[PDB]
């Protein structure tokens, strides 16, 4: 099968007027709802849609049924308390409250209260995708502790687009992240020292692990980082672009995240796998293997192969690093049942063993 | 297959590319609409007519230049063909009822195009300079033109043609009665339905033995042609993801690339246009219907059979428009001779030694 997986691709690669009109709706929904919140006097006034990639890129390394979108808000300077210990979760203080501030209408004593500010966020949208009758477009119903406001668009058929608060901070990166973001053999330090002079970011998706100030946690979230990474990947500055070579990175991804969301569609058993997973996975064979030579489009079989092997070693040792965050072990037992990894091993295995007969879809 | 294939590769634009300029182009478009929607203008009720989104980019013309209609419903019209160009008419009203903003641009019974192209002009001009947000500006009126075009240059230029278009719900033109002749391709019941929706009017004058006339209107498909364009195939799932890829769109994009850089080097190719290559394309997809004739492998027969039939359309001096089949776009009177014969030398030197004009690396 050494071009079985072009031929999956192929087939994967949406209708280019698919992408303009689904992402020129959501666009529409967003960039209106966007500003109909920066025209309301509430507290999230000075907001700004966060630049993570569109639609249109999206659809090429995820599935095009499920997009996000990050509003960032900047806030005064913040004072970042770890909670616990993965060092992804916080809370948030003020240095110091402005006076007047209306941000102060969410604080739950000292801390930034994630739900009271998610809450009136939700709030907000919710008045506004109401007066949206240009497209047909609801807002799901919440799901506790998820930081994401999930509209549903379903102009024809089902889109759906989480909306996701995010604080913006411009001070140093917190120390937990000292050691993350390993990119010095492979994009290289001037690189890292420049995505590290941008600012974070955080989602108020709350841990689940306290004596209720759970409610008030924050999660940081380099998706912007992340984004870069995607799109400026190879060792080369030209891979992948018009005067240079090719790779098979995104398509190596493509794959693996098309593999994991057919797995999970026949088996609730995988509920707790997410694209995150295999996204960190990949950012870390990409460390490994930075040269775009390791990444040859006459060579997918074997890159495939050489990160499907690297996944499966994450599961069975149970240890998964947040590529951002070296502390944070996405895959340990207190998040993910062993049994559960070792469920989806078992099905990668037996995917990997017998020709990928799950992509016999013609 | 021998560079042809590897020709389209590099002319693929990745997607952040397209997502910025079409952003872009959308949100100046979507806001100089947004805002002559207001009130106190003879122009709201404009609306966007889908005549395709930024993938003109994608893999059928050039990044370079793009174009937007807005359309504008009228009432009722009566059309009296010019002369029998059949493609230019002069609109009339019936009558107006009572609030019509059009009877602004009315002379008699005229609704003038100059007069309302005028305004239509002077508007948007009064409002590309009240956004900072991007550079954009308005290039000088050219005379007879339908388009007031915008040039956008966040880093690099793109050049947006914004062309008003009437909109009439009446039957189409007599002149139009053989056009679309797309019965063993597409089909009768395409056919039908397509005739069903409304014809658009832009202000392009006609040119005549004296000069310019300055109030008659042409005839415009575009909203016909995104749908042929991408419902080009005899089986309804060509191109689909359950159906077989054709090269249709292929030999479309690869005969405006060959045409677009034929004319960048070359004064004497300024007659020749965009419009010629997809009319040529559209009589090509009529004579060979069926989607064996176009399938991928044969890339390289299908690209010359093209130019092969668009050089038998230069010495023959004929091209009829696909909807008007009376009206010649390589007529005498539109375009001379040394050009077609300029044309047909660069086409021919570059089709027999392998398209030269081609290299890259
Ligand atoms: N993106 C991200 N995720 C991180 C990070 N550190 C830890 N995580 C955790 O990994 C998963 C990611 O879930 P995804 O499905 O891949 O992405 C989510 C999701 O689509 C919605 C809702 O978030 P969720 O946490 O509620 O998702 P669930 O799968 O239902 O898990 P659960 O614990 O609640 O039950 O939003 C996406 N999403 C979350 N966070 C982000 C984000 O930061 N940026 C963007 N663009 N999308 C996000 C989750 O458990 C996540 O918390 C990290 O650094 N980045
Ligand atoms: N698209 C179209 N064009 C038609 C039709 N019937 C007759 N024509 C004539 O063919 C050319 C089209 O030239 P294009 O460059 O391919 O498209 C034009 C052009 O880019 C601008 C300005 O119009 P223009 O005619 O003034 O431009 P020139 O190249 O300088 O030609 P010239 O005769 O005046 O010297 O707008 C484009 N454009 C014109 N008309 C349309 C239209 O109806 N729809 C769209 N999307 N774009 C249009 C022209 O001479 C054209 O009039 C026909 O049915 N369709
Ligand atoms: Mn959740
Ligand atoms: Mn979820
Ligand atoms: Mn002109
Ligand atoms: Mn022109
Ligand atoms: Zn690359
Ligand atoms: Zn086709």
Same mark, same amino acid.
């Given at each position: 099968?050494?071009?079985?997986?072009?031929?999956?691709?192929?087939?994967?690669?949406?209708?280019?007027?698919?992408?303009?009109?689904?992402?020129?709706?959501?666009?529409?929904?967003?960039?209106?709802?966007?500003?109909?919140?920066?025209?309301?006097?509430?507290?999230?006034?000075?907001?700004?849609?966060?630049?993570?990639?569109?639609?249109?890129?999206?659809?090429?390394?995820?599935?095009?049924?499920?997009?996000?979108?990050?509003?960032?808000?900047?806030?005064?300077?913040?004072?970042?308390?770890?909670?616990?210990?993965?060092?992804?979760?916080?809370?948030?203080?003020?240095?110091?409250?402005?006076?007047?501030?209306?941000?102060?209408?969410?604080?739950?004593?000292?801390?930034?209260?994630?739900?009271?500010?998610?809450?009136?966020?939700?709030?907000?949208?919710?008045?506004?995708?109401?007066?949206?009758?240009?497209?047909?477009?609801?807002?799901?119903?919440?799901?506790?502790?998820?930081?994401?406001?999930?509209?549903?668009?379903?102009?024809?058929?089902?889109?759906? /687009?989480?909306?996701? *608060?995010?604080? +913006?901070?411009?001070?140093?990166? $917190?120390?937990?992240? %000292?050691? =993350?973001?390993?990119? &010095?053999?492979?994009?290289?330090?001037? /690189?890292?020292?420049? *995505?590290?002079? +941008?600012?974070?970011?955080?989602? $108020?998706?709350?841990? %689940?692990? =306290?004596?209720?100030? &759970?409610?008030?946690?924050?999660?940081?979230?380099?998706?912007?980082?992340?984004?870069?990474?995607?799109?400026?990947?190879?060792?080369?500055?030209?891979?992948?672009?018009?005067?240079?070579?090719?790779?098979?990175?995104?398509?190596?991804?493509?794959?693996?995240?098309?593999?994991?969301?057919?797995?999970?569609?026949?088996?609730?058993?995988?509920?707790?796998?997410?694209?995150?997973?295999?996204?960190?996975?990949?950012?870390?064979?990409?460390?490994?293997?930075?040269?775009?030579?390791?990444?040859?489009?006459?060579?997918?079989?074997?890159?495939?192969?050489?990160?499907?092997?690297?996944?499966?070693?994450?599961?069975?040792?149970?240890?998964?690093?947040?590529?951002?965050?070296?502390?944070?072990?996405?895959?340990?037992?207190?998040?993910?049942?062993?049994?559960?990894?070792?469920?989806?091993?078992?099905?990668?295995?037996?995917?990997?063993?017998?020709?990928?007969?799950?992509?016999?879809?013609?």
């Amino acid at each position: 099968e050494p071009d079985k997986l072009k031929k999956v691709l192929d087939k994967l690669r949406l209708k280019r007027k698919d992408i303009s009109e689904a992402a020129e709706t959501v666009n529409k929904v967003v960039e209106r709802l966007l500003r109909r919140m920066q025209k309301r006097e509430s507290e999230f006034k000075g907001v700004e849609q966060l630049n993570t990639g569109s639609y249109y890129e999206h659809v090429k390394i995820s599935a095009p049924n499920e997009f996000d979108v990050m509003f960032k808000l900047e806030v005064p300077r913040i004072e970042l308390q770890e909670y616990y210990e993965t060092g992804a979760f916080y809370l948030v203080k003020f240095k110091r409250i402005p006076r007047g501030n209306p941000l102060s209408h969410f604080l739950e004593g000292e801390v930034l209260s994630a739900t009271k500010m998610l809450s009136k966020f939700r709030k907000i949208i919710k008045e506004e995708v109401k007066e949206i009758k240009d497209i047909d477009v609801s807002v799901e119903k919440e799901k506790p502790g998820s930081p994401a406001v999930t509209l549903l668009i379903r102009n024809p058929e089902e889109i759906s /687009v989480d909306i996701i *608060l995010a604080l +913006e901070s411009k001070g140093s990166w $917190p120390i937990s992240t %000292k050691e =993350g973001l390993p990119i &010095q053999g492979w994009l290289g330090t001037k /690189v890292r020292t420049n *995505l590290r002079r +941008e600012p974070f970011y955080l989602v $108020p998706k709350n841990a %689940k692990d =306290g004596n209720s100030f &759970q409610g008030e946690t924050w999660r940081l979230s380099f998706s912007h980082t992340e984004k870069y990474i995607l799109n400026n990947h190879g060792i080369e500055k030209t891979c992948c672009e018009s005067s240079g070579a090719k790779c098979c990175r995104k398509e190596c991804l493509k794959l693996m995240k098309y593999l994991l969301e057919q797995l999970k569609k026949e088996f609730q058993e995988l509920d707790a796998f997410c694209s995150y997973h295999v996204k960190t996975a990949i950012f870390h064979m990409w460390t490994q293997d930075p040269q775009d030579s390791q990444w040859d489009p006459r060579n997918l079989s074997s890159c495939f192969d050489k990160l499907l092997a690297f996944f499966l070693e994450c599961l069975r040792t149970e240890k998964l690093d947040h590529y951002f965050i070296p502390k944070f072990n996405l895959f340990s037992q207190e998040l993910i049942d062993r049994k559960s990894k070792e469920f989806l091993s078992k099905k990668i295995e037996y995917e990997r063993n017998n020709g990928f007969p799950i992509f016999d879809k013609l």
